[PDB]
Design a protein around this ligand. Structure first.
Ligand SMILES: *Cc1cc2c(cc1C)nc1c(=O)[nH]c(=O)nc-1n2C[C@H](O)[C@H](O)[C@H](O)COP(=O)(O)OP(=O)(O)OC[C@H]1O[C@@H](n2cnc3c(N)ncnc32)[C@H](O)[C@@H]1O
Ligand SMILES: O=C(O)CSC[C@@]1(O)OC[C@@H](O)[C@@H](O)[C@@H]1O
Length: 432
C-alpha cells in the first residue's frame, strides 16, 4: 500500500522531481518513506527551474499536450500552493516576416482545430492598433509590419519561488533528503546480478539507499547517469538580465510576455525591476567523456556544465549577440542597459519533444521521469500526478504511449528544433 511503500526521487530538488515528491505526499505516501536525493538542496541551484520566471503558454505539438496544458492551467489558477506564482498577463507572439506570419496564422488555426473553443481566449492581431492595445510599451514605428497572436490564458510563472514552495512543504512534512555527494546518484542497486530488480541507489560518496521504487528525475543530467541510448540529448539555453528603475518599469507593468521565434522573448520586470531576456536558437551541447550506468563502456555524451558549480561561467559570445538583438527588437529604449547574471540553463531533448516517463525496460522498480525537452516548467503542478500514476500502473495510454521507452525513434540532437545543436567546444567566450 502507499503508506508502506518507500520511494527514492533522484533529482527531487528540481522540476519533475519536486512535483513527483509533492504528489506522493498528496496520494498518501508516508513522508519518512520518501527520500529526495539531489546534489543541491531544494530548490536546486542548478535546476532548470531555478529561475526568476518561466512562460506559461499553450502548445499543441504532441498528442498529450492539450490535456497536460489544461490540467496545469487549472492548477496554476486554483491550487493554493501554486496560484500565488502564476501571473496571467497573457502572451503575444509576433512576427514581421512572411514565413513568421504564416507560422503565427497556422498556429492560430491549429488552436481552433482542437474544436474545444480556444478561439474565445486566443486571437490573431492583424493591425498595429490591436498590438498596441495589448502591449502599450511599443511604439508605432517599432511595430510597423508586425502581426500578432495573443493567447489570453497564459502569462509567466515565478519559477524558483514555486519549487521552493513545494520544498517548504516537503520539509515541513518530514520528507528525507540527501544533498552533495550523499545526494548525488551514482548507480542503481539490484537484488541480483541479472539487474532485473532495482532495490535502491548508491550515491557517489558510497551511501546506499534502499526503496521499493526509484524515480530518475535528473533533468539534463539523466542521460549522463544511466544509459538512455541517445533518446535524450542535453542542451543549454541562455538568458541575461537587465535592471530597470521603478519609473522605467512602470510602462511594463502587467504587460503580456512578448515572443518572436526569430528573436526570443522577454518577461515583464519582477518586483525588483528585473527583466529577463532569452534569445531563440536550437541550444548548445557540451559533449564530454562520461560513463552512464547500464553502458558497458564510456559514451560521448552532452554533459551539463553547471553554473551553480562554476558560477564564473556565463555564455558564448554568439549568445551575447543574439540576446542583444532581442533587446533591440523588443526593448530598444534599453539598448544601453548593462546585461548581467548571464547564464546557461540546461534541458534534455527527446527526438519528438515528448517526455520520457516510463519504467526502465530491464530494471524493474526503476522509473525514468525526464525528456523535459525545454518546455516542461509549466507542468510543475501536474506532472508529478502522472509519475505517481505510472509508479502505480495506472497511467492512461495517451500519456503512456507518448512517454514510452523508445530508443532509435529519431535524432534528438536536432529534435523538433531548426538544426542540430552546436557544441560549446566550438563556441568561444563562456568560460570568460
Ligand atoms: C533552460 C531554460 C529552460 C526553460 C526556459 C528557459 C531556459 C533558459 N523557459 C521555459 C518556459 O518559458 N516555459 C517552460 O515551460 N519551460 C521553460 N524552460 C524549461 C524548463 O526549465 C525545463 O523543461 C524543466 O524545468 C525541466 O525539469 P527537470 O526536472 O527535468 O530538470 P530540473 O528541473 O533541472 O531538475 C533536475 C535535477 O536533477 C538534479 N541532479 C542532477 N544530477 C543529479 C544526481 N546525480 N543526483 C541527484 N540529483 C541530480 C539537479 O540538481 C536538478 O535539481
Ligand atoms: O514552452 C514554452 O511555453 C516556453 S519554452 C522557453 C524556452 O526558452 O525554453 C528553452 C527552449 O525550449 C527554448 O527554445 C524556449 O524558447
Amino acid at each position: 500500500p502507499r503508506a508502506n511503500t518507500k520511494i527514492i526521487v533522484v533529482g527531487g530538488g528540481g522540476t519533475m522531481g519536486s512535483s513527483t515528491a509533492l504528489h506522493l505526499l498528496r496520494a498518501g505516501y508516508t513522508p519518512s518513506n520518501i527520500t529526495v536525493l539531489d546534489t543541491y538542496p531544494i530548490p536546486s541551484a542548478q535546476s532548470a527551474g531555478y529561475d526568476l520566471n518561466k512562460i506559461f503558454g499553450i502548445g499543441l505539438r504532441n498528442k498529450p499536450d492539450l490535456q497536460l496544458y489544461l490540467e496545469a492551467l487549472d492548477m496554476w489558477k486554483n491550487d493554493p500552493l501554486f496560484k500565488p506564482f502564476f501571473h496571467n498577463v497573457g502572451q503575444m507572439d509576433v512576427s514581421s516576416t512572411e514565413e513568421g506570419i504564416k507560422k503565427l496564422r497556422m498556429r492560430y488555426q491549429s488552436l481552433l482545430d482542437a474544436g474545444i473553443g480556444l478561439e474565445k481566449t486566443n486571437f490573431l492581431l492583424e493591425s498595429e492598433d490591436e498590438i498596441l492595445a495589448k502591449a502599450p510599451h511599443f511604439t508605432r514605428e517599432q511595430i510597423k509590419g508586425w502581426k500578432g497572436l495573443f493567447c489570453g490564458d497564459g502569462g509567466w510563472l515565478a519559477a524558483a519561488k514555486a519549487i521552493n514552495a513545494i520544498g517548504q512543504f516537503l520539509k515541513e512534512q518530514g520528507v528525507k533528503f540527501g544533498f552533495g555527494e550523499a545526494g548525488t546518484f551514482k548507480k542503481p542497486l539490484f537484488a541480483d546480478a541479472d539487474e532485473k530488480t532495482c532495490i535502491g541507489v548508491e550515491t557517489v560518496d558510497g551511501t546506499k539507499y534502499y526503496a521499493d521504487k526509484v524515480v530518475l528525475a535528473a533533468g539534463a543530467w539523466s542521460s549522463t547517469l544511466v544509459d538512455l541510448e541517445e533518446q535524450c540529448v542535453s542542451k543549454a539555453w541562455v538568458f541575461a538580465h537587465i535592471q530597470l528603475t521603478p519609473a522605467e518599469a512602470a510602462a511594463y507593468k502587467n504587460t503580456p510576455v512578448i515572443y518572436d521565434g526569430d528573436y526570443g522573448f522577454f518577461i515583464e520586470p519582477d518586483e525588483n525591476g528585473i527583466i529577463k531576456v532569452c534569445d531563440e536558437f536550437p541550444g548548445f551541447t557540451h559533449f564530454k567523456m562520461h560513463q552512464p550506468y547500464g553502458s558497458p563502456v564510456p559514451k560521448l555524451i552532452s554533459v551539463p556544465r553547471s553554473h551553480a558549480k562554476h558560477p564564473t561561467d556565463t555564455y558564448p559570445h554568439a549568445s551575447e549577440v543574439t540576446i542583444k538583438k532581442a533587446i533591440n527588437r523588443f526593448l530598444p529604449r534599453f539598448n544601453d542597459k548593462e546585461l548581467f547574471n548571464r547564464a546557461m540553463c540546461w534541458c534534455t531533448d527527446t527526438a519528438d519533444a515528448n517526455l520520457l516517463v516510463c519504467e526502465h525496460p530491464r530494471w524493474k522498480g526503476f522509473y525514468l521521469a525526464t525528456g523535459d525537452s525545454g518546455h516542461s516548467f509549466k507542468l510543475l503542478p501536474n506532472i508529478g500526478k502522472h509519475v505517481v500514476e505510472l509508479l502505480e500502473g495506472r497511467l492512461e495510454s495517451v500519456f503512456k504511449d507518448a512517454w514510452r521507452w523508445r530508443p532509435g525513434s529519431g535524432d534528438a540532437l536536432k529534435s523538433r528544433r531548426a538544426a542540430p545543436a552546436k557544441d560549446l567546444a566550438d563556441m568561444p567566450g563562456w568560460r570568460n
